[PDB]
């Protein structure tokens, strides 16, 4: 299971189980830069459970190498995650 690097903003739609990594999360307080998901079985980031929950990027601790390691699992065509900036 290799973590595939991606850049923000990032979203994914549909079923499957995927491993992604990024170093692009906000580390300063910004309630506009968030992660959200729905209809997932699992969304874990650095061992923290965010499955189907809204969280600001700055609330998610990085790993000790400065990356965020994301494990996604969904079983539906409308399973979804997004990691992005609030448009307003
Ligand atoms: Ca990057
Ligand atoms: Ni605008």
The candidate with the shortest Cα–Cα distance to 62, out of 27, 18, 11, 29, is 27
Number of independent structural domains in the chain: 1
Rounded-to-integer distance, Cα 54 and Cα 6, Å: 20
> 53-57, long-range: CB within 8 Å, 24+ apart, which pairs?
56/26, 56/29, 56/30, 56/31, 57/25, 57/26, 57/27, 57/30, 57/33, 57/83
Burial group, residue 28, by CB count within 10 angstroms (0-12, 13-18, 19+): exposed
Looking at the CA of 7, name the nearest ligand: 1
* CA 76 distance to own-chain centroid: 17
9 with 87: CB under 8 angstroms?
no
Decide: helix, strand or coil at residue 42.
Answer: strand
Rounded-to-integer distance, Cα 71 and Cα 44, Å: 5
Q: What is the resolution of this structure in A?
A: 1.5
- Return left, alpha or beta for 52; rule: phi > 0 is left, psi -120 to 50 is alpha, else beta: left
Rounded-to-integer distance, Cα 47 and Cα 78, Å: 24
Cα-Cα-Cα-Cα torsion 19, 34, 8, 22, nearest 10 degrees, comes to -40
> From the CA of 34, how far away is ligand 1's center (Å)?
16
Looking at the CA of 85, name the nearest ligand: 2
Experimentally, the structure was elucidated by X-ray
87: containing domain: 1-88
């Amino acid at each position: 299971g290799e973590y595939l690097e991606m850049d923000l903003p990032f979203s994914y739609d549909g079923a499957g189980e995927y491993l992604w990594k990024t170093d692009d999360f906000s580390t300063t307080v910004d309630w506009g830069r968030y992660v959200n998901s729905w209809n997932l079985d699992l969304l874990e980031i650095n061992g923290n459970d965010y499955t189907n929950r809204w969280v600001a990027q700055h609330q998610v601790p990085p790993a000790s190498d400065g990356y965020w390691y994301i494990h996604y699992k969904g079983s539906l065509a409308w399973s979804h995650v997004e990691m992005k900036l609030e448009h307003h």
